[PDB]
């Protein structure tokens, strides 16, 4: 038994969101199984949504119950999932469940299969490359045995970049934080520590790659 | 609806421990059938929610032992009798017994550790945001244990709320500890308006608060 979701991956606010899982291993008609989609916001928890029964009855969550369509075509073995007028708050992981029982006490069921999910980021930016930016501290911070330097990746769209120090050869004593969507775009950071007889006597650089806009940047950290 | 709380939402344990964790619901879940649709779901890290335990106390098939449910009405309890490495991630409880179909928040099983202070660094605009009309003051705070710390920004002695950003990385796999970074975004313009820049954190390894500042002209 394998479920799969597939999706846009990016919507813009307004646009409707058509999700679909599809099934193998099993014939849907057959089973009896009910199917549903749960999804998990950035930064929250599990979210049921909608389940839809073998007989094609279906159930939603009245929170977005007006902008949610569930359907299925037992010929294709699929689940379709529809969200209207799509915004931020929409980005999440899909996840399809089918809602499986051992075969037939139909009473005792429970989500026993889950797709591996499908993300959604919504947005309203077009493809937007990082501006890349030093951090330096400032000189009454450098007195210290340690230092900690810092670069902060802001407004990107979309995910991923992939950010190095001194082109990989500084990893040790390294911290680069998850990226966050905020007024549509991306802004990550990272911070690196280094003894104070390591900086500013050698160069430190951090390197930012954005694929999407096929950007690479370097950014010396010069003291202030 | 049917409120699902759970509690704690955050279990540090060693693994080798009991963990228990409670599901209260706001009403009963008995469904009109008899049964109690209540289910505990794990959320591993990078994985998919896999199901371990379903009409209360009955154990999926492949879920170790270890795993137990109990409860009745309204309170509800999951336990591991010695938690293991594999074990470590989100659990939620489940009501499928109403609609809307309801989850507690989850509980993050996670590593204890000793207490340990943050190293905090705090950063200047760069010359480079500036000339774009733009002004960051970013506020690290890294390496620490426990998780719970409040951070503060502070702007010429008065408390900033808006134009933050904040993210935290997951607890580390060597050390155990967490960091956090702060963004407080300001316009240029406002940025050359005030003097001093103070990110202020309360952490339990500091009796007072933990401060790093900067003024704009030093
Ligand atoms: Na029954
Ligand atoms: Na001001
Ligand atoms: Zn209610």
């Known amino acids: 038994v394998t479920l799969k979701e597939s999706g846009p991956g990016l919507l813009k606010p307004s646009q409707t969101l058509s999700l679909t899982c599809s099934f193998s291993?099993?014939?849907?008609?057959?089973?009896?199984?009910?199917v549903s989609w749960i999804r998990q916001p950035s930064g929250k928890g599990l979210e049921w949504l909608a389940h839809?029964?073998?007989?094609?009855?279906?159930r939603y969550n009245p929170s977005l119950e007006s902008r949610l369509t569930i359907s299925k075509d037992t010929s294709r073995d699929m689940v379709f999932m529809k969200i209207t007028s799509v915004d931020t708050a929409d980005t999440a992981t899909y996840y399809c469940?089918?809602?499986?029982?051992?075969?037939?006490?139909?009473?005792?069921?429970?989500?026993?299969?889950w797709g591996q999910g499908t993300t959604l980021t919504v947005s309203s930016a077009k493809t937007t490359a990082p501006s890349v930016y030093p951090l330096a501290p400032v000189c009454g911070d450098t007195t210290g045995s340690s230092v900690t330097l810092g670069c902060l990746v802001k407004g990107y769209f979309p995910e991923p970049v992939t950010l190095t120090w001194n082109s990989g050869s500084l990893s040790s004593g390294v911290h680069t934080f998850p990226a966050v969507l905020q007024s549509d775009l991306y802004t990550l950071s990272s911070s690196v520590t280094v003894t104070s007889s390591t900086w500013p006597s050698e160069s430190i650089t951090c390197n930012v790659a954005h694929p999407a806009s096929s950007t690479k940047v370097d950014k010396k950290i010069v003291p202030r | 609806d049917v409120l699902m709380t759970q509690t704690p939402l955050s279990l540090p344990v060693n693994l080798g421990e009991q963990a228990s964790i409670s599901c209260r619901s706001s009403q009963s879940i008995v469904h009109s059938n008899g049964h109690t649709y209540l289910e505990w779901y794990l959320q591993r890290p990078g994985q998919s929610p896999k199901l371990l335990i379903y009409?209360?106390?009955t154990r999926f098939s492949g879920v170790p032992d270890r795993f137990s449910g109990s409860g009745s009405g309204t309170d509800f309890t999951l336990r591991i009798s010695r938690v293991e490495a594999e074990d470590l991630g989100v659990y939620y409880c489940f009501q499928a017994s109403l609609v809307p179909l309801t989850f507690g928040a989850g509980t993050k099983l996670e590593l204890k550790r000793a207490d340990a202070a943050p190293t905090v660094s705090i950063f200047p605009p760069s010359s480079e945001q500036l000339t774009s009309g733009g002004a960051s003051v970013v506020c690290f705070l890294n390496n620490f244990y426990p998780k719970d710390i409040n951070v503060k920004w502070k702007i010429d002695g008065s408390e900033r709320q808006n134009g933050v950003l904040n993210s935290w990385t997951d607890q580390d796999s060597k050390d155990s500890t967490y960091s956090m970074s702060s963004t407080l975004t300001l316009t240029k313009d406002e940025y050359e308006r005030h003097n001093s820049y103070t990110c202020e954190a309360t952490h339990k390894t500091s009796t007072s608060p933990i401060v790093k500042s900067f003024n704009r002209n030093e």
């Open positions: 839809i029964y073998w007989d094609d009855d279906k």
């Open positions: 291993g099993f014939s849907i008609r057959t089973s009896k199984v009910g």
């Open positions: 009409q209360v106390s």
């Open positions: 469940a089918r809602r499986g029982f051992y075969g037939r006490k139909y009473e005792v069921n429970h989500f026993d299969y």
